[model samples]
Target: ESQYQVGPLLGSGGFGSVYSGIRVSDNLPVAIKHVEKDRISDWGEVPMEVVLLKKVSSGFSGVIRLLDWFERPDSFVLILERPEPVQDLFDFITERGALQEELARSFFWQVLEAVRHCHNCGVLHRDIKDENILIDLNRGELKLIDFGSGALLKDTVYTDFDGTRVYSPPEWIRYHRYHGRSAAVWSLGILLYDMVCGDIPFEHDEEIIRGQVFFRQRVSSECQHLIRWCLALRPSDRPTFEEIQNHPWMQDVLLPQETAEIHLH
Candidate 1:
């Protein structure tokens, strides 16, 4: 605990605040996410995140990095390699009023790559949205964060009511359950729609959001249809990550070489 000096708060989660800090000896900056005492022993999610991250360390290049950590009976601190806090994907889209085709394609490709990697590792990332997706605009790279709902499988059901409603799929709502990859496809489709249109495709009404986003809301013939087939309402109809890679938009002139390589471990 004496090894670092905790500083101003950077963000907050369900458990507690994440602070900007620095190592006392080296004066190196880091993000320290502190969780409440009661949470560590009570819930399994945090520990799962830690273990999952450890297993996928090499895959986190464009994602958030867990640099070092300290755990005690009372509380715990996560040492993070800090990336410049830029606007989230939602705000970034709103501010820019819609991404250029090339940028949209590039971003879509990178995000899918991240998702594919997680799925391959048997992690689901049930929640995928604009807010959890961050980027360093100056560097043009993407980071997918917040893994609380990751690793769910076909029979997995949650009574806790998770994920951003605006982007969640209908099957997850109706069954209160899902196959992880299927749920992810729905959310990603919503994100892709927002990337092109600058806003989500659903009405605020719960019924509308859940029903139409699945039954309707066709992917436009625009640059964002990279994985259009995967957005289908039925789980069986959605495309696999491998299929997404071979999509027509992958051949689009707007996509980047690195974006195409997003899923490789």
Candidate 2:
């Protein structure tokens, strides 16, 4: 704690304000996210993000490194690795508009790998959006971050929504209850579309339940097919990560070989 130093504000949002920081001893750059006590909740005695992140901090290439954390009277501090020359995917997309098929597939594959790792650990990254994903510009690598909206993955149904609404599954909006994995599948589709299409498919609750994403720009037929599968209205119809992992559009991207299972059960 004494060895860390906080610098200028990096950014701010509803959850907290982030600041630039460094570990004095090694001069390691880090991001300090200050979540006011009232703005965050806990899973048992620990913050939800901490519990989820700690569970999957096993050197996954797509996850942000959680260096350490601190407690304050009115807030909590999360010491996260500050990878230089990085920006959130949202801004990256905004600046460049839509991305090419190969690039989007590469980034999407990394994210799915991260999500798969978390799901295997019984953690559901409830909030999966461009804003929550960081891209290291130097390597063009991606890291899934901001687990504030995450929760333990359960076979049972979830009645509440926590992540960005635009990325949410249609079943949740229509029925108010959804299983962990299927909803995640829906967001994956939404994210894929946003990555290559420059915007999310739906903007309203009704439109989401309607579940029609008319492609304005031309993408490959196979890519559109997978997106349609992910955005399937029925949860059961949504393809699991393993299916997406093996999708033709994902050819040669190369994911871990697996026997089976990547959610949607």
Candidate 3:
């Protein structure tokens, strides 16, 4: 609590503002996200992000590292590892216009690996859009951040949507209830399409339900096939994360020699 100094503001949203900070002992850079107490319904209890982070803190490479957290009178401050030369995928994609297939594949595979880790731990990241993904532009590495919308996996259906509307799976819209794994796969599909094409695939709920995707840029057949499978209208039709990671497109993706092998089972 007394070992760090909050620095400049990094970014802000409805829930909180993330600020740059540094450790007093080692001068290590960190991101401190301050969420107002009153803004949270469960003030006296541990927040879901903290709970989920603690559960998955056992050396997961694809997710952000939670160093520490502090409880304030008016807010909760989360001390997170700040990757140098980092930026959110949203702005990264906006500036680059579109990512090449190989590049998108590299990043998407990492994202999938992270999501798989979360599911393996019995946590569900209900919100998984580009804005929630941070990128190390210099290294082509990705990290999953902003677990405010995460929840423990439940056997029943989830009726309410806590994530970005555009990433909602077809089952959520058509039935008003959806499961976590399938919805996550759908969002990843949307994410993959956005990464390579520089735009979202569907314009509205109707289009998402129809699951009709038209690619503007030329992509590999394998890439297109994986995307289509992910965006399948029926949840059962969507491939599991295991299947996604083992797809032909994923097999052909070549990463830097330094890239560690991601184990997804």
lDDT of each residue in 136-224, candidate 3, tens digit only:
65555788988787788776788877678899998888888898898899999999999889999998989988889999988889999
User: All candidates' lDDT scores?
Assistant: 0.65, 0.84, 0.83
lDDT top scorer: 2
> How big is the positional error of residue 121 in model 3, measured in Å on the Cα after superposition?
1.5
The pairs that clash in candidate 2 are none
Tens digits of per-residue lDDT for model 1, 1-265: 6888988886786736778888888988777887766764324545655655554456455567777767777777678666564456877776777665567778877788887766666666667888777775545677777665554344555444456776777766666656667677777777777776677677564652344433223334733344356567687787777777677765553333343244211
TM-score of 1: 0.79
* Candidate 1 backbone overlaps, count: 1
Candidates ranked by lDDT: 2, 3, 1
Candidate 2 regions with alpha-carbon error over 4 angstroms: 254-265
Tens-place lDDT digits, model 2, residues 110-164: 8898899889888899888999898776666678888888888999999987788
